[PDB]
Amino acid sequence: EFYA
Amino acid sequence: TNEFYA
Amino acid sequence: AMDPREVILCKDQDGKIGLRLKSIDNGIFVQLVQANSPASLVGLRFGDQVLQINGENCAGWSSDKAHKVLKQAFGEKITMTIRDRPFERTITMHKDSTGHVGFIFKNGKITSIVKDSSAARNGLLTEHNICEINGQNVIGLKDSQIADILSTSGTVVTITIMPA
Amino acid sequence: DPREVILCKDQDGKIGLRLKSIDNGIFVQLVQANSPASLVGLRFGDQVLQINGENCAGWSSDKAHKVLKQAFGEKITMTIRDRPFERTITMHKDSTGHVGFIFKNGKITSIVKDSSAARNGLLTEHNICEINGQNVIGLKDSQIADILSTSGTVVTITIMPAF
């Protein structure tokens, strides 16, 4: 979902 | 038991 | 090996100090701290262990038990003996050319590690909650606020984490 | 920081090491005693970051086993992060000679009421790794109990969560  | 008591 | 500290906290009119507790592996840990509560003021955080409440061992108690001890506690001040986030680890990564350190997250948790990334090189682990990012606590934030902190950071990215 | 080790194969190949996947990392699970692994001080719980210039992130146990089993040449290069899950707890024996816990198969199962263990917040579902700096991984429980018997009144144990 969220890429760091 | 076969538990040991520390 | 890493030393306990005493906190002293005052009850509200309902007896509360602004704290939710959780039983993990027959200890008691801070689960949630309420904004601008006494708990908050004395620096309690998600993942800190409560060894004693008013001198009584927390060993083997449930969350329900721990909470009722707080609720029944006599007088207006509550003493707790605290061990600072015993499970905490810190990893320092470097953003690449695309501005990323190399991991997928959701609900403030690391869910996968991207191959060939700074995160991969550093052995960053999944099923781990992110506590802080460059000295910014991310506990109780939406993933959008976490992503904003990440993007605004400089190349070097230090994160504290603990097993979920 | 991590540390770099360079292992050297026995004749046969094998370096006395079993690895294990946990939370998309790779961890030392068992070290044989007079092995290539033991020479470079690998221990239970050590995280293996890299093997021969390849990151271990996302590898399965089966894949770690195979990369090791198939390693080309004599030298196996690794980058090791020392037992990152390790915790240390210092307890004191009471008058009966007890610190306050029940264990079985090297693992803490319960904390005794009013004991040093309880006071110090020792946790269950944790493996016992060292007692006063002495490896107890691979020992029978009865051997662990005698080591406890011959420790001082001050017993320092090293623990890790079970996986």
UniProtKB/Swiss-Prot annotation, chain A:
It comes from the Eukaryota. Shedding is enhanced by a number of factors such as heparanase, thrombin or EGF. Also by stress and wound healing. PMA-mediated shedding is inhibited by TIMP3. Detected in fibroblasts (at protein level). Also expressed in epithelial cells. Disulfide bonds: none annotated. Belongs to the syndecan proteoglycan family. Homodimer. Interacts (via its cytoplasmic domain) with GIPC (via its PDZ domain). Interacts (via its cytoplasmic domain) with NUDT16L1. Interacts with CDCP1 and SDCBP. Interacts with DNM2; this interaction is markedly enhanced at focal ahesion site upon induction of focal adhesions and stress-fiber formation. Cell surface proteoglycan which regulates exosome biogenesis in concert with SDCBP and PDCD6IP. This is Syndecan-4. It comes from Homo sapiens. The lineage of its organism: Eukaryota, Metazoa, Chordata, Craniata, Vertebrata. The gene is SDC4.
Curated annotation (Swiss-Prot), chain B:
Detected in fibroblasts (at protein level). Also expressed in epithelial cells. Shedding is enhanced by a number of factors such as heparanase, thrombin or EGF. Also by stress and wound healing. PMA-mediated shedding is inhibited by TIMP3. Cell surface proteoglycan which regulates exosome biogenesis in concert with SDCBP and PDCD6IP. Homodimer. Interacts (via its cytoplasmic domain) with GIPC (via its PDZ domain). Interacts (via its cytoplasmic domain) with NUDT16L1. Interacts with CDCP1 and SDCBP. Interacts with DNM2; this interaction is markedly enhanced at focal ahesion site upon induction of focal adhesions and stress-fiber formation. Belongs to the syndecan proteoglycan family. This is Syndecan-4. It comes from Homo sapiens (Human). The chain holds residues 193 to 198 of 198 of the full protein.
From Swiss-Prot, chain C:
Induction: By IFNG/IFN-gamma in melanoma cells. The keyword Transport does not apply. GO terms for cellular component: adherens junction; azurophil granule lumen; blood microparticle; cytoplasm; cytoskeleton; cytosol; endoplasmic reticulum membrane; extracellular exosome. It is found in: Cell junction, Focal adhesion; Cell junction, Adherens junction; Cell membrane; Endoplasmic reticulum membrane. Expressed in lung cancers, including adenocarcinoma, squamous cell carcinoma and small-cell carcinoma (at protein level). Widely expressed. Expressed in fetal kidney, liver, lung and brain. In adult highest expression in heart and placenta. Residues 6-85, 90-164 form the PDZ domain. Phosphorylated on tyrosine residues. A 1,2-diacyl-sn-glycero-3-phospho-(1D-myo-inositol-4,5-bisphosphate) binds at N107, K142, D143. The keyword Secreted applies. Changing N107D: Disruption of the cooperative binding of C-terminal peptides from FZD7 and phosphatidylinositol-4,5-bisphosphate. Keywords: Acetylation, Cell junction, Cell membrane, Cytoplasm, Cytoskeleton, Endoplasmic reticulum, Lipid-binding, Membrane, Nucleus, Phosphoprotein, Repeat, Secreted. GO terms for biological process: actin cytoskeleton organization; chemical synaptic transmission; intracellular signal transduction; negative regulation of receptor internalization; negative regulation of transcription by RNA polymerase II; positive regulation of cell growth; positive regulation of cell migration; positive regulation of cell population proliferation. It comes from the Eukaryota. Coiled coil: none annotated. One of its GO terms (molecular function) is syndecan binding. It is a peripheral membrane protein. Monomer and homodimer. Interacts with SDC1, SDC2, SDC3, SDC4, NRXN2, EPHA7, EPHB1, NF2 isoform 1, TGFA and IL5RA. Interacts with NFASC and PTPRJ. Interacts with SDCBP2. Interacts with PDCD6IP. Forms a complex with PDCD6IP and SDC2. Interacts (via C-terminus) with TGFBR1. Binds to FZD7; this interaction is increased by inositol trisphosphate (IP3). Interacts with SMO. This is Syntenin-1. It comes from Homo sapiens.
